[model samples]
Target: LKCTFSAPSHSTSLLQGLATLRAQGQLLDVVLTINREAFPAHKVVLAACSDYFRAMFTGGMREASQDVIELKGVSARGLRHIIDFAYSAEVTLDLDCVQDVLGAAVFLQMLPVVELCEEFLKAAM
Candidate 1:
């Protein structure tokens, strides 16, 4: 007989662990600066979720070897939300901040967030 085991919450549990690490500022390799505010994060997690980060970190771009990167044209709040989503896979969207979040998502090439914001807007309309 052959058996397979599965745990539905395994991914969520793993992400939660990463989120804990992020909160503690443990094992973070890169810092993202926006509007003079700084956020420390794991490049692997960011790259996994964002094409922009993947390209910047692994595509031989200037930021590949850099530990700190400054991003322009994004609000700190917006970027914060995206990073939170990157680690936790959850985001809170509202009219007051949906546009900002969407803008940041688009800039970061995080299509899932962009789509979430789009759906939120469509539903609100």
Candidate 2:
């Protein structure tokens, strides 16, 4: 007997739909504010991608009950890249911005992204 595997063709469409929703800022449940600037996000997606978000939302912190999370001492651009990465599972970094993106990944506790950034930086040196 031989084995074969099949995956849903519509999964790509599903991911694209979610990414579209993210891009359009549609049906978002949470707002993250940094440097007095605001960005919309979904609790499920943020929680899935970041341990910091998971703990804040699920670990019974003050942020858990809040609709708007005000971030302190974090770069808006860095977090913006991370939000984009969360949807696409892809991150693009040049030498100029790699450190900022890496800092964002570390702050968010995205170990995979952090590792990739670290390795990327090491290879550049």
Candidate 3:
């Protein structure tokens, strides 16, 4: 019998990103450690629709400024979503949302964040 390979269909997954970042010791410590305890578990919240992302998104906005390096302007709201997803490993991005988070993460030089996202996207190629 000949061996046949079947690749799984691609889906955006923050868990995969989290694992990759963890291996490199680049996952945001504040997010994974400190904040995680303050917040609900990612898988649980994500599945339960707990709306913790709203808080992550909110805290992220507290740091934006025009002086910061940014391509497309990082609105206070958009940045929050990025921070939310990054911390919780609960992605909900699409063509539109990706543009916002990519722009924000790039502006912040959040290497692991960007690298993690890029790795997920590259899997599709």
Candidate 4:
């Protein structure tokens, strides 16, 4: 048997708040410069949402304290989608961009994005 779920509006309100931050670029604490593009975002948000970001910020790495980090070998477009997902817990993946998105997900060690990639493939089929 499956269970019905309802997560209350206040909990979801946080997501909307974060989404607003993304749109307004407010309270952003770090800059991830990927492929020569600078993406401004809150370190706390990404760290809370992704273990990879968490590790990068807490595992004694140089980026742990840097206000601006340089990420190489990542497509700027792919990084953009990942940041979008970080702020909203949502992503829109289509055939034209799935590979690029998945590659960034793999690089960031984002499990949900990988799951989405797999699920997207199933849906595509």
Candidate 5:
């Protein structure tokens, strides 16, 4: 005999919990430094959200073993928005900030945020 169970809300709840943990600065394993600003984060969540991170963190790259990683060409504000979206699955975009956020998303290879930024731009047209 076998049993199958499913909870459609599980992923949402898990991400919500992770966001709460991030807000509390708990269980963080890495620090991402951008433009002299440091952001603490979990590797798994970042890897799950971004192909760039997944490769950098787990694909035997130099960053794979680093506790603190420095990234270039992305602003602190833009990276912060991307990290926030990684944890909460939500992001706020406006005409003034969308370009910056889009650039960051592009650099990070976070397709969802990139698509969101694209949608926002299209709607503004």
Candidate 6:
């Protein structure tokens, strides 16, 4: 998925805050359209997992996709964590399934989800 990143560093850093929402995956469809009129064509370099982000910041995404950290054990509910999180920062994790979601939030670059999960986990314990 490192190929997903094909743009410049400055551009990536520029969308730093917005990327959280975009990375979540839902805003790409719903909220994005409401912002720009044709969303500047060409390609968008997306930083998925932290490694991908680091690689992009350093050498770039020229490496093989396999080199990028593959987010394993992704499921429908996990995808929901990926999607619902992408739109609004709001997230709800199942107690039985929080670890999966925590990893998803980290992978997806949704800091709020990670933070919220941390707090929730703290209280749960």
- With a 3 Å backbone cut-off (N, CA, C), the pairs that clash in candidate 6 are 5-45, 24-86
Residue 113 C-alpha lDDT in model 5: 93
Candidate 2: list runs displaced more than 4 Å.
Answer: 1-13
Per-model C-alpha lDDT, please? 0.91, 0.83, 0.46, 0.86, 0.91, 0.50
By descending TM-score, how would the candidates be arranged? 5, 1, 4, 2, 6, 3
Model 5 ranges with Cα > 4 A deviation: none
**Clash list (residue pairs), candidate 3:** 57-80
Candidate 2 C-alpha error for residue 61, in Å: 2.9
lDDT of 6 by residue, 16-108 (tens): 556564555433421111122222110123333334334543564443233322233444355456545543446776688787788766765
Clash-forming residue pairs, model 2 = none
Whose lDDT is higher: candidate 1's or candidate 6's?
A: 1
Question: What ranking of all candidate models by lDDT puts the best one first?
Answer: 5, 1, 4, 2, 6, 3
Output candidate 2 Cα RMSD.
Answer: 3.2
Better of 2 and 4 by lDDT: 4
lDDT of 3: 0.46
TM-score of candidate 3 against the unseen true structure: 0.35
Q: Candidate 2 lDDT, tens digit per residue, 96-121?
A: 88878888888988888888888888
User: How many clashing residue pairs appear in each of the predictions shown?
Assistant: 0, 0, 1, 0, 0, 2
RMSD of 4: 4.9
Model 5 per-residue lDDT tens digits across residues 1-125: 89999999999999999999999989999999987789999999999989888988997558798999997778888999999999988899999888789999999999989999999999998
The most accurate candidate by lDDT is: 5
**Against the hidden reference, what TM-scores do the models get?**
0.88, 0.82, 0.35, 0.85, 0.93, 0.42
CA deviation > 4 Å runs, candidate 6: 1-73
What lDDT score goes with residue 36 in model 6? Answer: 24
- Quote the positional error of residue 22 for candidate 1 in Å: 0.4
